Amino acid sequence: MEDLIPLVNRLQDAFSAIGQNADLDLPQIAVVGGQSAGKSSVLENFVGRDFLPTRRPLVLQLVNATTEYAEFLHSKGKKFTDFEEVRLEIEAETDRGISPVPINLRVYSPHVLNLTLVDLPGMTHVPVGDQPPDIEFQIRDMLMQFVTKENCLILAVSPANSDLAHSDALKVAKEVDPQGQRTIGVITKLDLMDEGTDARDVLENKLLPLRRGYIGVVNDITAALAAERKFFLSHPSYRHLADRMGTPYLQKVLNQQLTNHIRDTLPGLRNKLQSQLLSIEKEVEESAEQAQRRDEMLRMYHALKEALSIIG
Template identity: 35%
Template structure:
């Protein structure tokens, strides 16, 4: 339920689910919720994780968003799935686990608080109770010992307790609040509970204040995460190719690609830098040259003209030795210098 203060005297109510918007009013809101629930989860007491949002825009209501989670069911009935408990527990944990959530534990005054399943689940995600608030319903049904239960806090409710009276029958909201105020003012036992811990208006005020505190605490981290995702999306968008709408833009993009390819070739062939292809050994010239020489050596050994029973290539090596001529130490022979000049000229031509 999303409550929003609205200056208009006429309240506005509508449901949102599955991309639909269904307008309703205060008199028919219960029927509208039942019809939407049947549409989402069926009419056989099925369950669904699809959220059903009731938006209430009304003058005087607090700006507050509350999520009414399904009640815990351990035994499936009327064709419900066998893992009904696991499904409901998964839905509940998904909503109460985030640090931004306030856990509003609804407890009946007629039961012992330590035995409540909802308390056990909330303690799993909020061990210190710093974001858990308890609402004690049916205060008028079990007033004996209620003061001691909410003041002892045996179950570690960090944000405290608020005791309320349930609406009875067709009571209007205004009548219910009057009866509630009368109950906690005049009842011999309930009147002893501190007035900061009783009543629906106190609960609404507490929730609004706690929500503001939680938002203020979590907002910087939320903004940081949003900025990180935004920057990552912008970087990814900038890396995507731009739409080319004219021949001039196409030529500019093509020349950029050619320039990038030339720079990559210079890095690989001249400077021997392989940072663009760290894992691609086929682009490493030295490794490729060794591989090619090994292949060539194997081809020579397997060549029919080569006889492995005699000295391999010794005749060719002796011819090369004879052609070397007289040399000075530490100077390249003339044939080698000429070959080097031919290689440089050929590369320059290309």
């Protein structure tokens, strides 16, 4: 089943066309991190190009393919070769506070595996620029709409070179998933720890256990990936773990865990979407509010019908 991740990408597109994602409990990986956790670099190392500026969710659909381009759902036909204009388009579509309405970005490339990640805004604490006083709360509350849903896997990104108790990602993950059953740990910045310290206890799954494990990473992609591989092979604390460390390994294990997760939950999703259809089918058998309520219901009907056709 090379088609399972693509199948769910089509489900994501169907619901993103009507500005929906979080409420439908789709099987997906949400990427969670504090603003200084190194989340952006993890995603850019998967793509192998710099493309991030965020105030909305980015449904980043990496597709294995012979040809290399990017495609936004909201401008359906336009093929993107320049990832500098991909960055500009993310900013542009965002300006179209915080919103849970997803931006869907499909990247085709032979350097990527079949993998989809829902990147959520970095957690912050102090307002900067024209952000409101409660920006911390707005971001955290929007994150919660995604990560409270049972089919959401949490990619919890934490820096190695700070106390793990300070991790914004793990504070969120502990709240919604206290048993650590759907949280995958990413440990960044292992090259920027203090002299005579290491994160071996975390990376060996001993300090704060997660069922799905911890993967270490370090941030011209070919040179960057080469330097990462060389770091893990050279470092005496991480020599023995080296073949389950780094961004290629991380990308591989997420492909495997997402594929298996979609396999487990997609039949349950069909049932839940069917119950939603039966409920909304009863509802269908005028102010600006009342018209807007009718239009939203019809858009939802269309997305559900499109989605059920994808599942088959």
